[PDB]
């Protein structure tokens, strides 16, 4: 186990020696601005999603507009399937919103 | 002693690792932190603009509702050309953020 | 004595080479070599830098290039038996890791300059052919060629 | 000297002041302070600029040598370059992450870029690397601009 380490001390300081030097000069330049130019991409889809629950809680606020027409028995038995495609209707709608803001 | 002046050789590449720490807790921790949820991102990336394909798809199998609605199509159609104006530029800006870095 | 030393001035480690061939070779010198005084001042003042040559103070100027730019040639080189062999493996490839980013660096800056010129002297070929008319024309054009040519080097 | 980056010039800082002032300290504790010591200079062709100062010029050409590699010396320590860009199972086992460690370094050396490295040392690094931003594109387009006199004619 002695000679056998310490010769891996010999390849992870070989490992280190230009792994130090050689990275330093490159990413430090560019570090900051390397996780920026995702991070202004992934806001930007994060806040449509946001918006997208919005559009989705506009679906929401239309259930509430189709509350009034939901009283009305006529088109609630299509309303009450609606609402369970409705109901589905979110899912896809919803995992478009869901890692979107991820 | 030559093994042994080599393990004292040894004794000489374990400091550097007292040396570039100083730097190397610069080195270890953000780029890697940096890289891998990009890495991560590029697979999340490559799921990002995928599930949308078969959300159309998806949005086949629940097609019936849109046109019953008063007005459902129109709340996904906006939001997915806000998201392929996404992917309409294809870093193309973002290419010029990276010449900026790169040069 | 100062007849040779004109001769010594230009260099000291290549003149023993001729140096004993010299005196033979010459005797114009020895005529400025009897006005010693004369001689000897000018001599006096620059004789500190004359001994060193002009090739090596120039061995100098390229000590700075050698640290840091250096162009000249570069190297690139049973259960504890399985350890063994993953050391064995491990170290010629962490090895053939660390001397492959070497083995580069000596062309590594060039290529830039390698595949920029191919392409640009692949435009150069039909320009160069007919180009005195429209200049004004053409300066346009490489201002954008090289926009795809950044493109390249950034990608 | 070599050491210490800042150590190493303050005696060259000084020096150029010093060398002189040698030759102004030579029988006189201060140079305007001491009598004794002007007559021992001489004004043209004094016995300093004869022999000390010879001497001196001797090891110029040997002292502007040690500098550039005091230089240097000073440079590599404030940036370092160099050629540009049961338990014994586990300790076989240690070996593995250690050797899944190296592939990850491995990928680490180009996980940032391998075409920017790999055909650039320095493209935006310090040296010359403003200089390509300071110009259009590239410092080279000089070295293109030279034969487009000869392309428009």
Redesign the interface.
Same mark, same amino acid.
């Not at chain 4, 075409?115 to 493209?123: G, I, K, L, N, Y």
């Not at chain 4, 000869?150 to 004619?153: I, W």
């Given at each position: 186990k002695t000679w056998?380490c310490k010769?891996?001390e010999?390849?992870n300081a070989?490992?280190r020696?230009?792994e130090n030097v050689?990275l330093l000069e490159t990413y430090t330049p560019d570090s900051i601005s390397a996780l920026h130019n995702i991070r202004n991409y992934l806001v930007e889809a994060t806040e449509e999603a946001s918006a997208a629950y919005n559009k989705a809680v506009t679906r929401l606020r239309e259930y509430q507009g189709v509350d009034p027409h939901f009283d009305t028995i006529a088109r609630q038995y299509h309303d009450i399937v609606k609402k369970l495609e409705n109901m589905q209707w979110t899912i896809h709608q919803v995992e478009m919103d869901l890692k979107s803001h991820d | 002693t030559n093994l042994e002046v080599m393990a004292v050789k040894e004794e000489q590449y374990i400091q550097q690792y007292k040396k570039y720490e100083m730097l190397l807790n610069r080195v270890g921790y953000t780029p890697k932190i940096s890289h891998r949820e990009l890495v991560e991102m590029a697979e999340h990336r490559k799921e990002l603009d995928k599930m949308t394909k078969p959300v159309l798809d998806t949005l086949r199998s629940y097609q019936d509702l849109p046109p019953d609605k008063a007005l459902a199509a129109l709340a996904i159609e906006d939001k997915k050309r806000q998201f392929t104006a996404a992917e309409k530029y294809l870093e193309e800006v973002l290419?010029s953020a990276?010449?900026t870095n790169?040069? | 004595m100062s007849s040779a030393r004109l001769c010594s001035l230009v260099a000291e480690l290549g003149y023993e080479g001729a140096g004993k061939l010299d005196p033979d070779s010459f005797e114009w010198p020895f005529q400025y070599d009897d006005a010693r005084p004369i001689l000897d001042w000018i001599c =006096?003042?620059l %004789?500190?830098?004359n001994? @060193?040559s002009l090739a090596?103070?120039s061995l100098? #100027?390229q000590?700075?290039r050698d640290?840091?730019? @250096?162009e000249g040639d570069?190297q690139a080189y049973w259960?504890?038996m399985? #350890? @063994?062999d993953?050391?064995g493996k491990? +170290?010629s490839?962490? =090895?053939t $890791?660390?001397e492959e980013?070497?083995l580069?660096?000596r062309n590594?800056?060039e290529?830039?300059?390698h595949? $920029?010129?191919d392409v640009?002297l692949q435009r %150069?070929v039909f320009?160069?052919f007919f180009? +005195?008319p429209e %200049?004004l024309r +053409?300066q346009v054009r490489?201002?954008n060629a090289?926009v795809r040519? %950044?493109?390249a080097? =950034?990608? | 000297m070599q050491s210490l980056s800042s150590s190493a010039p303050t005696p060259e800082a000084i020096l150029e002041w010093l060398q002189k002032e040698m030759g102004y300290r030579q029988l006189g504790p201060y140079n305007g302070s001491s009598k004794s010591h002007v007559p021992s200079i001489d004004a043209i062709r004094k016995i300093c600029?004869?022999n000390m100062i010879?001497?001196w010029?001797?090891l110029?050409?040997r002292v502007?040598?040690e500098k550039?590699?005091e230089?240097?010396r000073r440079?590599?320590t404030v940036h370092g370059?160099?050629?540009?860009?049961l338990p014994? /199972?586990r300790?076989?086992v240690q070996?593995?992450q250690?050797?899944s460690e190296?592939c990850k370094?491995?990928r680490g /050396?180009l996980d940032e870029w391998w075409?920017?490295?790999?055909?650039?040392?320095?493209?935006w690094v310090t040296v010359d690397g403003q200089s390509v931003a300071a110009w259009?594109?590239?410092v080279?387009?000089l070295l293109?601009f030279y034969?487009?006199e000869?392309?428009?004619?």
């Open positions: 056998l010769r891996c010999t390849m070989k490992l020696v230009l050689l | 290419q990276l010449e790169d040069e | =006096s003042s %004789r500190p830098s001994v @060193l090596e103070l100098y #100027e000590f700075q640290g840091k730019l @250096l570069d259960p504890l399985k #350890e @063994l993953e050391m491990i +170290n490839k962490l =090895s $890791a660390v980013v070497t580069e660096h590594k800056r290529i830039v300059k595949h $920029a010129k640009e %150069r320009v160069d180009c +005195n %200049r +053409n490489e201002l090289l040519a %950044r493109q080097s =950034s990608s | 600029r004869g010879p001497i010029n001797f110029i050409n502007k040598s550039t590699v230089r240097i440079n590599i370059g160099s050629s540009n860009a014994e /199972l300790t076989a070996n593995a250690a050797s190296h370094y491995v /050396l075409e920017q490295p790999a055909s650039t040392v320095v493209d259009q594109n590239h080279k387009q293109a034969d487009k000869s392309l428009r004619t």
